[PDB]
Amino acid sequence: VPDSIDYRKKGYVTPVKNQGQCGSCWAFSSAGALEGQLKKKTGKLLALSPQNLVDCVTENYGCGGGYMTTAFQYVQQNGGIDSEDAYPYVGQDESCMYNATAKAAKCRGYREIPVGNEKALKRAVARVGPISVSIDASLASFQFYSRGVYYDENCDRDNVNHAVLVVGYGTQKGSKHWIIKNSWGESWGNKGYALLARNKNNACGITNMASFPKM
Amino acid sequence: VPDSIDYRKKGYVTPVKNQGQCGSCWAFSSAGALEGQLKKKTGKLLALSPQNLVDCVTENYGCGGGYMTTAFQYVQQNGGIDSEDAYPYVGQDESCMYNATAKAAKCRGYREIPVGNEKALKRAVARVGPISVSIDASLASFQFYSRGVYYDENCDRDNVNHAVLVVGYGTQKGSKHWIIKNSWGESWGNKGYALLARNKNNACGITNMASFPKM
Ligand SMILES: *[C@@H]1O[C@H](CO[C@@H]2O[C@@H](C)[C@@H](O)[C@@H](O)[C@@H]2O)[C@@H](O[C@@H]2O[C@H](CO)[C@@H](O[C@@H]3O[C@H](CO[C@H]4O[C@H](CO)[C@@H](O[C@H]5O[C@H](CO)[C@@H](O[C@@H]6O[C@H](CO)[C@H](O)[C@H](O)[C@H]6O)[C@H](O)[C@@H]5O)[C@H](O)[C@@H]4O)[C@@H](O)[C@H](O[C@H]4O[C@H](CO)[C@@H](O)[C@H](O)[C@@H]4O)[C@@H]3O)[C@H](O)[C@H]2NC(C)=O)[C@H](O)[C@H]1NC(C)=O
Ligand SMILES: *[C@@H]1O[C@H](CO)[C@@H](O)[C@H](O)[C@H]1NC(C)=O
Asked: What gap in Å lies between CA A70 and CA A91, rounded to an integer?
């Protein structure tokens, strides 16, 4: 269980994208966790298609929200997910334009993190790879974040509303933290990433609804 | 376990190639099995590089022969194998031009089939996918094969000499058989493939030295 890991360094994370006015955070987190596991099983890093999931996960609400665990199950039961090149993101709802030949990755299921167990998520990021998580992104202080180890005592520990991708953890200026990839472009945060308070009583509900895919 | 399986049908096999005057049959067999497992885990069929292995598997003899098991072990310790596009075949010895960004597949080790146990190999083809094997391909009846279920009682069950890739099994005109991909071009055999006698006492030593990579 290392003290510090940054899966960007290790070639596991695709470039930050911008979801725009579509509410498709859940699909960027899914594709992000699956990108990491495809890299771990293979040697190649390949950006997979959130649009694939936006259009096709019927048990989700397209641009109006969804879950990662059900996204994973779609790609499992669907037996594949297309690549972003095959199925580029357009940020608006449409019919399932899935094409089974442009298939770039598969899924054998998912496992969920124990709710409220930051010590557990620390091991999971280190062992598995980038972990899909859900947070409270509703406060103004989180939307306009740019630097430092985010910590807001009004961040709701009990309810979440926005999906991101945990890509590491560590410590900066003596404050332990999670490293997150958001889907708000590189203009947001620190080149699209942030550092959130860690081991501080589940700040913003990071482990309230976390999962990762099996491959 | 099915009566019949044909991984050509399922998109698991790349097109037949021609090894030429280089003795690198073992490398096409290896890459073929790695192609099969990459398709099973990810869904994409991508032709991998035998030249990668010819140049870089130091414990093999390059164009002068080699083993699939030692090829697999290279890709494990090397942490990757390049794609045929990145590292095209030239049918001649040269220096290890491996490029880790062109990594297209990895290996976690290998497993061997019980020697002389066709019933076991049948399970592996059905369960795992295409299995690298070695046979006696030295006789004229095999060189001039074009159609039907190959069977020569003079085929050496004890000393194999040429690597192929078992890509299925089944039955034709009441003769149980293996389906193999050879590396002698499409002009040989039935568009580069053949059918070898199965459950006829380990014909041509088909199970004498069979393995597949772990991923
Ligand atoms: C080892 O293998 C490496 C990988 O091989 C490739 O992969 C597979 C498919 C193989 O089968 C090969 O066929 C491939 O070559 C080899 O590395 C490749 O080498 C090529 C030649 O040196 C490179 O192409 C040349 O470079 C550009 C094209 O740029 C490409 O870059 C990436 C590649 O994935 C991508 O676009 C992104 O580029 C930036 C990547 O960092 C990215 O930067 C981000 O920018 C953000 C802000 O904008 C932000 O700040 C981020 O922080 C920042 O990182 C960009 O934003 C893009 O998103 C595209 O694929 C893109 O195509 C091009 O200029 C060159 O064209 C020349 O061609 C002609 C001359 O004939 C003429 O027009 C000009 O002279 C022109 O200059 C050329 O295409 C390729 O990029 C490179 N790929 C990688 C991944 O490294 C390597 O050579 C091999 N080495 C050896 C020794 O074998
Ligand atoms: C699916 O994608 C492939 C390219 O990978 C393309 O050749 C094929 O026509 C596509 N199928 C459609 C558009 O139905």
From this structure: 20
